[PDB]
Design an enzyme around this catalytic site. Structure first.
Site, mmCIF file in Angstrom:
data_model
loop_
_atom_site.group_PDB
_atom_site.id
_atom_site.type_symbol
_atom_site.label_atom_id
_atom_site.label_comp_id
_atom_site.label_asym_id
_atom_site.label_seq_id
_atom_site.Cartn_x
_atom_site.Cartn_y
_atom_site.Cartn_z
ATOM 1 C CG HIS A 728 -2.025 -0.838 1.179
ATOM 2 N ND1 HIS A 728 -3.074 -0.481 0.791
ATOM 3 C CD2 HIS A 728 -2.151 -2.307 1.454
ATOM 4 C CE1 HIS A 728 -3.854 -1.612 0.484
ATOM 5 N NE2 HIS A 728 -3.436 -2.645 1.084
ATOM 6 C CE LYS A 737 -9.022 -5.859 4.354
ATOM 7 N NZ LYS A 737 -8.313 -5.448 5.812
ATOM 8 C CE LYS A 754 -1.970 -11.011 0.835
ATOM 9 N NZ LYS A 754 -2.711 -11.155 2.194
ATOM 10 C CG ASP A 802 -27.424 -25.327 21.923
ATOM 11 O OD1 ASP A 802 -26.747 -25.847 21.123
ATOM 12 O OD2 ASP A 802 -28.586 -25.581 22.009
ATOM 13 C CD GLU A 891 -24.597 -30.176 22.166
ATOM 14 O OE1 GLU A 891 -24.383 -28.951 21.743
ATOM 15 O OE2 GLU A 891 -24.699 -31.089 21.199
ATOM 16 C CG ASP A 1140 -30.018 -20.862 17.898
ATOM 17 O OD1 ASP A 1140 -29.576 -21.680 18.784
ATOM 18 O OD2 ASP A 1140 -29.774 -20.944 16.909
HETATM 19 MG MG LIG Z 1 -28.041 -27.216 20.449
#
Ligand SMILES: [Mg+2]
Ligand SMILES: [Mg+2]
Ligand SMILES: [Mg+2]
Ligand SMILES: [Mg+2]
Ligand SMILES: [Mg+2]
Length: 1185
Positions: A728, A737, A754, A802, A891, A1140
């Site tokens: 750049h 961005k 970069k 979850d 979970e 959810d």
């Molecule tokens: Mg679930």
RNA sequence: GAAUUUCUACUGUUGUAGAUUCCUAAGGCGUUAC
DNA sequence: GGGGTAACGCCTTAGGATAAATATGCTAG
DNA sequence: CTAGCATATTTATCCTAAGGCGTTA
């Protein structure tokens, strides 16, 4: 906040490796390049790999030559045979301890066979490389001068192989580790051998079979005691050759079971034994040349008859109509599906005609059908949907010629795009003509006389086009193979034992010192020829500028370094141990493991050790302050005290001019330990590793050591991976961005390149450190966590995580009473600065990955983004738990995994759990004060050390794991769960199923229906109470899934309206207000019952999902005994708002049940944290609390 | 088209925010396209 | 849901995260 | 014949405290 976790600090020690960058200082790099250390170290690494391979071959030969003379006792073999196959019986002492005893006996026999060989004496010593390996290479038939030269290059670098030899030492061990030869031969090969023996005996004894019984050496004729010869790699290889595969014993059974098609015959397929441990284009120019060569071969110039495959094949296909169709064959593979799809639009017409009209047994499935037979079958295919008369005529030949010429009329034709298009067209043509091609020979008979005039030319024409497949394989091997390479070369600087230790006495043998000037740390690796430059320092005057060398002192292993030094041959005459002490040490009475333990003897030995330590000149400078010797339960406590107090760091001023002279003269290789937080421009909070490195030498830390500088560090050298750059330009604004930043244009006074760190050659430095150096013994803190939770009940919240469908991750924080305190979707993270909508850019990367992998230019990634997204979720969870006094319930992905269709798959969630566990092992806050609970020197430890995914159980400290069964389909209100299964297609059973309903009545008031039942009639397991499921919820229906007008779709349907429109068709009156239970028993019209059951499936399941927008809710069909039905849309701010958050809320509720269970139990260290479905369902339906 | 011990998101301005245990060795399992 | 294949990915496990005694090469003789 | 130094290579060897089962999303 801080009080709940105040006691969980300094529990267990951790070892972590810090990585930095070594910036050469002054003339360091010039001297390194002058002496050519980098190239010599690269060559040394290559030679190291080659010698590793040679030593591996030597070990393989030793194993083969040692295990051919082992003779098992045999008496224990039948004992193992009877113990293993005496049925399940009960998990008693005879089942486990005797099995362990016989396994250990066999392993000890194998290890005794190993140690008897003479080579084992000098297999992990310098004698190997010096005189045994060269002898083995000389005796080798092929060998070579290169192998001997490579081995002799390491004539003096034997200590470089210490790690490899210690890795190899594991194989010849009798331990329960999985890296042992004996353990493998006892636990993997032998059990499968016994299983194969028993299954073969059963198969042979039961009855003769269709295939030959192998009656016409052989393991069959000699099966008993054959395992003794299976131990060697050659023996097991010959065994597997006899059984596996070439005709083998189980090959016939595999061929015959397919005839049987029986499960009871599939399993007898004998499993193979596990193998023995340690057993066994160029550039674009070439591709362009190959492409041009193929183009010349295909088209050429129409010389010496028509050799153009493009047009000759088309003409041959067009001439198929004239050729007889009674001899032309057609493939039975997906080519038939494509032909059916092209000709009629349905890809099942031809196969259905063949399976329904050609013949009806196993339909004599043949690899290739006939064109005449296909035409005959298609001439009469029951005409499912078509015109009364179809002008197919020669339909197959018509389609062939159509796709040959009239498809596009554009068959004749450096950049990939043109090459890719041409290749794709060629492959399309070759796949189109493949069904007419004959693959191999003798394919299930058939292959009778063919049409010579057509097939003779077709076989000669197809061979030229057959070259695309190897060409495709070469193209996909070469062109598809990310921009940078993280490949580094270990640097030794001519020292085999480089950086192996930091001690002052070993700094001349390890050639590595640590300096520090003005807050910047340096690493000095003296030249091996001048390794004694840090021992004759003239003065430490402070008038001029000075560095600060590190004086590192350590007593690494007390249990080894104390007896080694105090009882050595050259020191036993100095410390002068009495005869009693020598007898005590020899007899082993001090060791608790020994059977002759004596507390007074151990205390006497400890007193002698203390006297010797006070006698030692170097160890009496540690300032050892020991607790009274009468307070040691065993010598282990004394060793712990010695190790804890045996560590000291002090800094000595050394003149800067002297160090600069050393660097200039080439005697010192000065590197600066660098990290972007050491830059003079850094202003924000530094990395955690920077804080750890700075605290390694902090005076407050050195007052009472918490972080320890470990030895055996490594220095690497990484080369440049990207020659060209993407810069750049300076003073040119760059578009931001993030779409939330208030500023859109950013202008810099310097260039931004970069991947700048990969365009230049970079040194590396991996520093191991030990946090919580004095954390005594607590690696399993579950005992203290439960004991603490048993008392402070109304202070601890619960956190549930979850993995949802619409959200990447969801969190719900509930109080001990039950009501939600804070819920938020984790698909977007909100820090003190701009928020990253990680849900959005994840989907953008998902689209870009398939776009790149389809056309060209594949970069993939994605995995790192998903593994870099969870790195912020982990920090969020840690901060939330610390600032809300909450346990984390997640979970359990071992015993209960959920289904698919989740944005976070099972494997990614496992890594999230692992990273959360790792973060909670040492949880510091970058802003908290050092001497504060949670600070740098008082880190929280709220989780046991990670061992394995299966080692952790239902608790990992403050983390709890609960089964995910019935977590997303229950009400936050009274917990009705869909336990129904209509199971239609049985007309007789429908009437009985509906008979069990208590009352089916119409409620004119409130506009919905009423279904009354009890969970005792259905779901024979007696639990729960009478339910009153109504028809107010589940107003989303999916019509179908396939094709068009029956694709996955969502239609808003009023279930009561459908009830009325179904009941009016059969005069089932409901307006009278009476029950209609004795109205459905009219039988007939199975379509009515099918529709009624399909509608019932659409009135008692709560989750209504759509494939489009975010429309998602958990509207419930049961009453809350208050006059309202739960609906996710009407969120109360205390129930899960979206569809959810229900899973997270119910996982938090499971954690609440776990907390209550811990509270009631008075048998800690044995608590049962496993929640079964029955007790969970009882807990949810609390009714009268 | 964006700087990093390294990764992710950045421009937060030669860097911003948060993860970050590295090396060696052995073995097992799995899309696939041959 | 498919006949005897390995480039690639995933997973499991193990060792280490040491200073000092001791044997050996080299100079001296 | 050979004391002394420098360098490479093998060596010394605690004790705790474990850990399990409820099917199904
Ligand atoms: Mg679930
Ligand atoms: Mg050395
Ligand atoms: Mg920072
Ligand atoms: Mg950085
Ligand atoms: Mg980046």
């Amino acid at each position: 906040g801080p009080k709940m976790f105040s006691n969980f600090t300094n529990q267990y020690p951790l070892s972590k490796t810090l990585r930095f960058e070594l910036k050469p200082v002054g003339k360091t790099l010039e001297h390194i390049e002058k002496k050519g250390l980098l190239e010599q170290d690269e060559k040394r690494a290559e030679d190291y790999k080659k010698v590793k391979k040679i030593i591996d071959e030597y070990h393989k030969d030793f194993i083969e030559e040692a295990l051919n003379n082992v003779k098992l006792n045999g008496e224990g073999l039948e004992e193992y045979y009877e113990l293993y196959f005496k049925k399940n019986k009960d998990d008693k002492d005879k089942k486990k301890k005797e099995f362990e005893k016989i396994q250990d006996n066999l392993r000890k026999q194998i290890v005794e066979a190993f140690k008897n060989h003479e080579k084992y004496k000098n297999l992990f010593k310098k004698e190997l490389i010096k005189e045994d390996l060269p002898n083995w290479l000389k005796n080798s038939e092929d060998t070579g001068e290169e192998d001997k030269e490579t081995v002799e290059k390491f004539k003096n670098f034997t200590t470089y192989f210490t790690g490899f030899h210690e890795n190899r030492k594991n194989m010849y061990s009798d331990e329960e580790k999985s890296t042992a030869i004996a353990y493998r031969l006892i636990h993997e090969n032998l059990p499968k051998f016994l299983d194969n023996m028993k299954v073969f005996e059963k198969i042979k004894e039961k009855h003769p079979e269709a295939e030959q019984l192998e009656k016409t050496n052989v393991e069959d004729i000699f099966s008993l005691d054959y395992f003794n010869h299976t131990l060697t790699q050659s023996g097991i290889d010959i065994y597997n050759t006899i059984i596996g595969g070439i005709q083998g014993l189980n090959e016939y059974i595999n061929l015959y079971r397919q005839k049987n098609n029986e499960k009871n015959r599939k399993l007898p397929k004998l499993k193979p034994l596990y193998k023995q441990i340690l057993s066994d284009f160029e550039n674009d120019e070439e591709l362009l040349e190959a492409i041009e060569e193929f183009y010349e071969n295909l088209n050429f110039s129409n010389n010496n008859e028509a050799t153009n495959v493009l047009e000759k094949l088309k003409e041959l296909l067009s001439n198929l109509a004239d050729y007889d169709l009674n001899k032309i064959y057609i493939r039975n593979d997906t080519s038939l599906t494509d032909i059916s799809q092209k000709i009629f639009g349905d890809w099942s017409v031809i196969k259905d005609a063949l399976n329904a009209h050609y013949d009806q047994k196993w339909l004599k499935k043949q690899k290739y059908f006939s064109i005449a037979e296909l035409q005959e079958a298609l001439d009469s295919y029951c005409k499912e949907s078509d015109e009364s008369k179809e002008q197919k005529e020669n339909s197959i030949a018509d389609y062939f010629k159509t796709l040959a010429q009239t498809k596009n009329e554009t068959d004749k034709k450096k950049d990939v795009e043109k090459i890719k298009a041409f290749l794709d067209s060629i492959m399309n043509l070759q796949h189109f003509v493949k069904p007419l091609h004959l693959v191999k020979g003798g394919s299930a008979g058939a292959e009778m006389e063919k049409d010579e005039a057509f097939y003779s030319e077709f076989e000669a024409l197809y061979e030229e086009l057959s070259q695309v497949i190897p060409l495709y394989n070469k193209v996909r091997n070469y062109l598809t193979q990310k921009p940078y390479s993280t490949e580094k070369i270990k640097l030794n600087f001519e020292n085999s034992t480089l950086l192996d230790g930091w001690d002052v006495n070993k700094e001349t043998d390890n050639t590595s010192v640590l300096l520090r000037k003005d807050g910047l740390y340096y690493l000095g690796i003296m030249n091996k020829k001048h390794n004694k430059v840090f021992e004759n320092i003239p003065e430490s005057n402070e008038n001029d500028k000075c560095y600060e060398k590190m004086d590192y002192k350590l007593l690494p292993g007390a249990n080894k370094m104390l007896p080694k030094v105090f009882f050595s041959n050259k020191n036993i005459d100095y410390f002068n141990p009495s005869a009693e002490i020598l007898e005590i040490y020899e007899n082993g009475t001090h060791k608790k493991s020994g059977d002759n333990f004596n507390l007074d003897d151990c205390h006497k030995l400890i007193d002698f050790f203390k006297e010797s330590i006070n006698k030692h000149e170097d160890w009496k400078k540690f300032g050892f302050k020991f607790s009274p010797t009468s307070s040691y339960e065993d010598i282990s406590g004394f060793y712990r005290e010695v190790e804890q107090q045996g560590y000291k760091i002090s800094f000595k001023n050394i003149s800067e001019s002297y160090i600069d002279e050393l660097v200039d003269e080439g005697k010192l290789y000065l590197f600066q330990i660098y990290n972007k937080d050491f830059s003079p421009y850094s202003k924000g909070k530094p990395n955690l590793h920077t804080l750890y490195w700075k605290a390694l030498f902090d005076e407050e830390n050195l007052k009472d050591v918490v972080y320890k500088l470990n030895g055996e560090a490594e220095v690497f050298y990484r080369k440049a991976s990207i020659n060209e750059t993407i810069v750049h330009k300076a003073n040119e604004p760059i578009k931001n961005k993030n779409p939330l930043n208030p500023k859109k244009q950013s202008t810099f006074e310097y260039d931004i390149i970069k991947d700048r760190r990969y365009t230049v050659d970079k040194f590396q430095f991996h520093v191991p450190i030990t946090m919580n150096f004095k954390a005594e013994g607590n690696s399993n803190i579950n005992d203290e966590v439960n004991e603490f939770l048993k008392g402070n009940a109304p202070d601890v919240n619960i956190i549930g995580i979850d993995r949802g469908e619409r959200h990447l991750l969801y969190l719900t924080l509930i109080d001990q009473k039950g009501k939600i305190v804070e819920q938020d979707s984790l698909n977007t993270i909100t820090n003190e600065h701009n928020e990253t909508d990680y849900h959005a850019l994840l989907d953008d990367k998902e689209k870009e990955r398939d776009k790149a992998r389809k056309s060209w230019g594949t970069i993939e990634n994605i995995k790192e983004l998903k593994e870099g997204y969870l790195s912020q979720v982990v920090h969020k969870i840690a901060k939330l738990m610390v600032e809300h006094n909450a346990i984390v319930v997640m979970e359990d992905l071992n015993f209960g995994f959920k289904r698919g269709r989740f944005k976070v798959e099972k494997q990614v969630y496992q890594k999230f759990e692992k990273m959360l566990i790792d973060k909670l092992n040492y949880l510091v806050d970058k802003d908290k004060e050092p001497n504060e609970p949670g600070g740098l020197l008082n880190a929280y430890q709220l989780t046991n050390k990670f061992e394995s995914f299966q080692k952790m159980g239902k608790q990992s400290g403050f983390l709890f794991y609960v089964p995910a069964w019935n977590t997303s389909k229950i009400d936050p209100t009274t917990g009705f769960v869909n336990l129904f299964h209509p199971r239609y297609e049985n007309v007789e059973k429908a009437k009985e199923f509906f008979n069990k309903f208590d009352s089916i009545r119409y409620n004119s008031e409130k506009d919905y229906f009423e279904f009354a039942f009890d969970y005792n009639n259905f779901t024979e397991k007696a639990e729960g109470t009478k339910w009153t499921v109504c028809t107010y919820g589940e107003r989303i229906k999916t019509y179908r899934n396939a094709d068009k007008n029956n694709q996955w779709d969502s239609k808003e349907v009023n279930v009561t309206e459908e009830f009325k429109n179904l009941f009016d068709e059969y005069n089932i009156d409901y307006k009278n207000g009476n029950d209609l239970k004795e109205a459905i028993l009219s039988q007939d019209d199975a379509d009515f019952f099918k529709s009624l059951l399909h509608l019932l499936r659409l009135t008692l399941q709560m989750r209504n999902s759509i494939t489009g927008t975010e429309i998602d809710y958990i509207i419930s069909p049961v009453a809350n005994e208050n006059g309202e039905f739960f609906d996710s849309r009407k969120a109360d701010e205390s129930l899960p708002k979206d569809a959810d958050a229900n899973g997270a809320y119910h996982i938090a509720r499971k954690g609440l049940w776990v907390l209550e269970q811990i509270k009631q139990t008075d048998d800690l260290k044995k608590v049962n944290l496993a929640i079964s479905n029955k007790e969970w369902l009882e807990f949810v339906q609390e009714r009268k609390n």
